[PDB]
């Protein structure tokens, strides 16, 4: 049998796991919100401060959080509306300070002005993120993905874009 203290110890471990899972789901939510909102300084706070990290998605690789946000600010300019919509996470806490997260991504991109005016891009991907916990806080260290599909097309210029946060 188990004493009351043993049962408390078990509960403490279980609750810590659930708390970590929830913290990670909110971290990834914040990442997507900052990414699509183009809130680059805030997005930087989701990335690990441990610069032993190579900040990579398996394709693109950078050596600091600032390098990541400098790339993104250039790659995702005001003329590009983006939606990165995460679904159905599978978060595994791997240790006291490491974890893995599978996410099912849908992405939609719309170029409103410039050289790529009226280009639309839609896709899907399976991401597997790696996270680390530093001084009580979870951060994103790196990821990899399989692209389910991606399509590029020209949007009808007669479509009426009635709202655009990057103009308003």
| Interacting residue ranges for its own copies, rule: CB under 8 A | 4-5, 7-8, 11-12, 14-15, 18-19, 21-22, 25-26, 28-30, 32-33, 36-37, 81, 83, 85-91, 102, 104, 106, 110, 123-124, 126, 146-153, 156, 158-165, 168
Minimum CB separation of residue 64 from its own copies in Å reads 25
Q: Which helix (H) or strand (E) holds 81?
A: strand 80-93
Are 108 and 120 in contact by the 8 Å Cβ rule? The answer is: yes
- Per-residue x/- marks for Ni ion, 82-101, CB under 5 A? ---x----------------
Annotated binding-site residue numbers for Zn(2+): 87
Query: Alpha-carbon distance 151 to 58, whole Å?
Result: 20
For Ni ion, which residue has the nearest CB? 85
Residue 73 has phi, psi (to 5 degrees) of: -60, -40
Annotated binding-site residue numbers: 87
Are 61 and 147 in contact by the 8 Å Cβ rule? The answer is: no
Under rule CB under 5 A, residue 159 binds Ni ion: no
SS3 letters for 16-54? Answer: HHHHHHHHHHHHHHHHHHHHHHCCHHHHHCCECCCCCCC
Minimum CB separation of residue 83 from Ni ion in Å reads 9
Minimum CB separation of residue 36 from Ni ion in Å reads 13
Which parts of this chain interact with Ni ion (CB under 5 A)?
85
């Amino acid at each position: 049998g188990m004493t009351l203290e043993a049962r408390i110890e078990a509960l403490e471990k279980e609750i810590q796991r659930l708390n970590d899972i929830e913290a990670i789901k909110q971290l990834k939510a914040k990442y997507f919100r900052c990414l699509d909102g183009k809130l680059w300084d805030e997005l930087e706070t989701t990335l690990s401060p441990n610069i032993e990290t190579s900040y990579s998605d398996g394709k693109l690789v950078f050596h600091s959080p600032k390098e990541v946000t400098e790339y993104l600010a250039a790659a995702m300019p005001k003329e590009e509306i983006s939606m990165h919509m995460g679904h159905t996470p599978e978060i595994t806490i791997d240790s006291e300070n490491t974890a893995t997260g599978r996410w099912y991504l849908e992405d939609n991109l719309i170029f409103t002005d410039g050289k790529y005016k009226n280009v639309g891009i839609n896709g899907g991907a399976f991401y597997t993120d790696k996270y680390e916990k530093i001084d009580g806080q979870w951060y994103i260290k790196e990821t990899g993905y399989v692209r389910i599909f991606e399509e590029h097309f020209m949007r009808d210029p007669k479509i009426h874009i009635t709202s655009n946060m990057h103009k308003e």
